[PDB]
Short mmCIF file of C-alpha atoms in Angstrom, two decimals:
data_model
loop_
_atom_site.label_atom_id
_atom_site.label_comp_id
_atom_site.label_asym_id
_atom_site.label_seq_id
_atom_site.Cartn_x
_atom_site.Cartn_y
_atom_site.Cartn_z
CA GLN B 30 13.33 4.41 -8.20
CA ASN B 31 10.72 2.68 -5.93
CA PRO B 32 8.35 -0.33 -6.24
CA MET B 33 4.95 0.33 -7.87
CA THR B 34 1.63 -1.56 -8.52
CA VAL B 35 -2.13 -0.96 -9.20
CA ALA B 36 -2.47 1.11 -5.98
CA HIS B 37 -6.33 1.28 -6.21
CA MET B 38 -9.27 0.93 -8.62
CA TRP B 39 -12.47 2.72 -9.67
CA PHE B 40 -15.38 1.20 -11.62
CA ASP B 41 -18.26 1.14 -9.09
CA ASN B 42 -18.62 4.95 -9.82
CA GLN B 43 -17.23 5.73 -6.33
CA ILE B 44 -13.82 3.98 -6.15
CA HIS B 45 -13.87 0.56 -4.35
CA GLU B 46 -11.79 -1.38 -1.85
CA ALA B 47 -8.78 -3.43 -2.94
CA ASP B 48 -6.95 -3.81 0.43
CA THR B 49 -3.15 -4.37 0.25
CA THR B 50 -2.77 -8.15 0.87
CA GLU B 51 -0.24 -8.33 3.74
CA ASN B 52 -1.79 -7.58 7.17
CA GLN B 53 -5.57 -7.61 6.50
CA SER B 54 -7.59 -9.05 3.60
CA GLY B 55 -10.59 -7.29 1.95
CA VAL B 56 -13.82 -9.36 1.74
CA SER B 57 -17.62 -8.76 1.53
CA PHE B 58 -17.68 -5.99 -1.12
CA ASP B 59 -20.54 -5.94 -3.70
CA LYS B 60 -19.33 -8.77 -5.97
CA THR B 61 -20.82 -7.38 -9.22
CA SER B 62 -18.15 -9.22 -11.39
CA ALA B 63 -19.51 -8.25 -14.89
CA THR B 64 -17.69 -4.88 -14.81
CA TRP B 65 -14.57 -6.76 -13.50
CA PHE B 66 -14.68 -9.18 -16.49
CA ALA B 67 -15.14 -6.34 -18.97
CA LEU B 68 -12.19 -4.43 -17.43
CA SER B 69 -10.09 -7.60 -17.20
CA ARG B 70 -10.64 -8.21 -20.93
CA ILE B 71 -8.76 -4.86 -21.48
CA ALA B 72 -6.38 -5.15 -18.49
CA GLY B 73 -5.11 -8.55 -19.74
CA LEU B 74 -4.70 -8.14 -23.54
CA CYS B 75 -3.88 -4.42 -23.71
CA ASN B 76 -0.30 -4.50 -22.29
CA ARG B 77 3.26 -4.56 -23.77
CA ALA B 78 5.37 -5.73 -20.81
CA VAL B 79 6.30 -9.17 -19.36
CA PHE B 80 8.12 -10.67 -16.34
CA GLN B 81 11.89 -11.11 -16.40
CA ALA B 82 12.46 -13.42 -13.46
CA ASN B 83 9.71 -15.95 -13.08
CA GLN B 84 9.68 -16.86 -9.34
CA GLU B 85 8.06 -19.25 -6.80
CA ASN B 86 7.26 -18.09 -3.23
CA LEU B 87 7.96 -14.36 -3.60
CA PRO B 88 5.94 -11.32 -4.80
CA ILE B 89 5.31 -11.96 -8.50
CA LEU B 90 6.69 -8.36 -8.98
CA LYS B 91 10.34 -8.68 -7.63
CA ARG B 92 11.07 -5.43 -9.56
CA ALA B 93 11.73 -7.84 -12.46
CA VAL B 94 9.91 -6.74 -15.63
CA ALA B 95 10.61 -6.07 -19.30
CA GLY B 96 8.43 -3.26 -20.75
CA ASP B 97 6.86 0.10 -20.00
CA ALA B 98 6.09 0.85 -16.36
CA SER B 99 2.43 1.88 -16.83
CA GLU B 100 1.39 -1.33 -18.64
CA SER B 101 3.15 -3.98 -16.52
CA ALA B 102 1.16 -3.33 -13.27
CA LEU B 103 -2.06 -5.00 -14.36
CA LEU B 104 -0.19 -8.04 -15.71
CA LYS B 105 1.33 -8.81 -12.30
CA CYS B 106 -1.90 -8.17 -10.34
CA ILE B 107 -3.94 -10.28 -12.85
CA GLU B 108 -1.54 -13.21 -13.42
CA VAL B 109 -1.54 -14.05 -9.66
CA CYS B 110 -5.36 -13.50 -9.88
CA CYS B 111 -5.20 -16.66 -12.12
CA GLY B 112 -6.23 -14.28 -14.96
CA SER B 113 -3.83 -15.95 -17.47
CA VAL B 114 -2.34 -13.12 -19.61
CA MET B 115 0.65 -14.63 -21.49
CA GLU B 116 -1.92 -17.24 -22.58
CA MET B 117 -4.58 -14.80 -23.80
CA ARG B 118 -2.23 -12.96 -26.20
CA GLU B 119 -2.46 -16.28 -28.16
CA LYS B 120 -6.16 -16.99 -27.37
CA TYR B 121 -7.13 -13.99 -29.52
CA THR B 122 -5.57 -13.37 -33.03
CA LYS B 123 -4.10 -9.84 -32.71
CA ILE B 124 -5.78 -8.38 -35.83
CA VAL B 125 -3.54 -5.29 -35.39
CA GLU B 126 -1.48 -3.34 -32.81
CA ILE B 127 -0.59 0.37 -33.21
CA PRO B 128 2.17 1.66 -30.82
CA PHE B 129 2.41 5.32 -29.63
CA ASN B 130 2.09 6.22 -33.34
CA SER B 131 -1.24 8.06 -33.74
CA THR B 132 -2.53 11.68 -33.79
CA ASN B 133 -3.48 12.12 -30.05
CA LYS B 134 -0.68 9.61 -29.02
CA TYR B 135 -2.52 6.57 -27.59
CA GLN B 136 -1.73 2.85 -28.09
CA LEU B 137 -4.35 0.39 -29.36
CA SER B 138 -4.67 -3.26 -30.40
CA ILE B 139 -7.59 -5.08 -32.11
CA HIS B 140 -8.28 -8.77 -31.48
CA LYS B 141 -10.99 -11.29 -32.49
CA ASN B 142 -12.60 -13.15 -29.56
CA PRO B 143 -12.81 -16.94 -30.17
CA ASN B 144 -15.57 -17.71 -27.64
CA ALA B 145 -17.02 -15.34 -24.97
CA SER B 146 -20.21 -13.25 -24.45
CA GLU B 147 -18.61 -10.21 -26.14
CA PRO B 148 -18.74 -9.95 -29.99
CA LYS B 149 -15.91 -11.19 -32.25
CA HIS B 150 -13.61 -8.22 -32.94
CA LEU B 151 -12.68 -6.34 -29.77
CA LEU B 152 -10.87 -3.02 -29.49
CA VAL B 153 -8.90 -2.01 -26.37
CA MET B 154 -6.40 0.90 -25.84
CA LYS B 155 -4.92 3.35 -23.32
CA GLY B 156 -3.74 6.96 -22.91
CA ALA B 157 -4.52 9.67 -20.31
CA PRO B 158 -7.73 8.89 -18.31
CA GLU B 159 -9.26 12.26 -19.34
CA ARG B 160 -8.64 11.30 -22.97
CA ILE B 161 -10.44 8.00 -22.50
CA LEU B 162 -13.33 9.97 -20.90
CA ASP B 163 -13.34 12.23 -23.98
CA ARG B 164 -14.31 9.25 -26.15
CA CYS B 165 -16.59 7.54 -23.63
CA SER B 166 -20.15 7.24 -25.02
CA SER B 167 -21.40 5.36 -21.85
CA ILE B 168 -20.23 3.91 -18.47
CA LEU B 169 -20.62 0.31 -17.19
CA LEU B 170 -22.09 -0.43 -13.77
CA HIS B 171 -23.55 -3.69 -12.35
CA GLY B 172 -22.94 -5.35 -15.75
CA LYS B 173 -25.47 -3.06 -17.59
CA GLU B 174 -24.55 0.25 -19.30
CA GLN B 175 -25.54 3.81 -18.16
CA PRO B 176 -25.77 6.83 -20.50
CA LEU B 177 -22.62 8.79 -19.63
CA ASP B 178 -23.49 12.24 -18.30
CA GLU B 179 -22.12 15.09 -16.14
CA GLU B 180 -22.89 13.10 -12.94
CA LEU B 181 -20.82 10.22 -14.27
CA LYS B 182 -17.97 12.41 -15.41
CA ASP B 183 -18.03 13.75 -11.82
CA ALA B 184 -17.90 10.28 -10.30
CA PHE B 185 -14.73 9.64 -12.37
CA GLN B 186 -13.29 13.12 -11.69
CA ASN B 187 -13.24 13.10 -7.87
CA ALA B 188 -11.86 9.58 -8.10
CA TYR B 189 -8.99 10.50 -10.51
CA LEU B 190 -8.40 13.66 -8.38
CA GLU B 191 -8.09 11.54 -5.18
CA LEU B 192 -5.73 9.09 -7.03
CA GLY B 193 -3.42 12.14 -6.91
CA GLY B 194 -3.08 13.27 -10.49
CA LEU B 195 -0.03 15.18 -11.75
CA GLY B 196 0.07 14.41 -15.48
CA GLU B 197 0.18 11.14 -17.49
CA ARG B 198 0.38 8.42 -14.72
CA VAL B 199 -3.21 7.08 -14.22
CA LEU B 200 -4.81 5.26 -17.26
CA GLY B 201 -8.43 5.06 -18.48
CA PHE B 202 -8.81 1.42 -19.83
CA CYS B 203 -11.81 1.26 -22.22
CA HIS B 204 -13.39 -0.93 -25.00
CA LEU B 205 -16.29 -0.47 -27.55
CA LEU B 206 -16.68 -4.16 -28.65
CA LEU B 207 -16.40 -3.83 -32.48
CA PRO B 208 -19.94 -4.81 -33.67
CA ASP B 209 -19.43 -7.80 -36.04
CA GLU B 210 -22.90 -6.92 -37.46
CA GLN B 211 -21.77 -3.57 -38.83
CA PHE B 212 -18.13 -4.73 -39.14
CA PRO B 213 -16.95 -7.19 -41.85
CA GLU B 214 -15.94 -10.85 -41.55
CA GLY B 215 -12.65 -9.92 -43.32
CA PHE B 216 -11.67 -7.31 -40.61
CA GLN B 217 -9.10 -5.74 -43.01
CA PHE B 218 -8.51 -2.69 -40.78
CA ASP B 219 -4.73 -3.09 -40.80
CA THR B 220 -2.45 -0.38 -39.34
CA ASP B 221 -2.59 1.70 -42.58
CA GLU B 222 -6.21 1.93 -43.72
CA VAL B 223 -7.80 1.38 -40.29
CA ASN B 224 -10.99 3.46 -40.94
CA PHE B 225 -12.29 2.23 -37.53
CA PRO B 226 -14.04 4.44 -34.90
CA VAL B 227 -12.15 5.75 -31.89
CA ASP B 228 -14.99 7.41 -29.98
CA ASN B 229 -17.77 4.96 -28.97
CA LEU B 230 -15.98 3.67 -25.94
CA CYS B 231 -17.28 2.51 -22.59
CA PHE B 232 -15.72 3.90 -19.38
CA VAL B 233 -15.73 0.34 -17.98
CA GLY B 234 -13.35 1.00 -15.09
CA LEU B 235 -9.85 2.14 -14.25
CA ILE B 236 -7.18 1.45 -11.69
CA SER B 237 -4.66 4.20 -10.64
CA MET B 238 -1.38 3.55 -12.38
CA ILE B 239 1.78 5.11 -11.01
CA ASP B 240 4.86 6.26 -12.90
CA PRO B 241 6.98 8.09 -10.26
CA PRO B 242 10.51 9.35 -10.98
#
């Protein structure tokens, strides 16, 4: 029906600025970055949509995408952020990728990291933001971790509530960085015998996806 995008983001435990780049420009926030990188590592890989029309001088959007209208948003807002996405799908190996096809209906995709601070195998996924929270063992602020607690649920709640929740529009974007110390160097999870955890996750941050009629 109408054009869509990120709208907003939350990760600082209190929402944050973004500022719609047309009239003004947002500057001078607390540039914490570590939480950004962590979120970006999800918000790049963990998508199944692409551009249709590549373009030059226009909005990278141009209502011109192939793939589901929750997952495409980040791609557009990250690509123009020089956060090379159609590259990174090939940077990592794509151990596995499960579609909608699981018990609580999520989608997930496991990838080995070639070279970054994070450990080798990485897990990323999405579903309802509440359902991410359900599986969150901690939250990530200032590039640390904090032990997730009622206070930190609250800080997410009021945020999600303000984002104007209705059902399954917003997304929860989390990881748990599959510990290559416990996990094997053969990473034979597959999509059949996975036997992986789904409930260690970090809250890292979220955005505010739309999916209007």
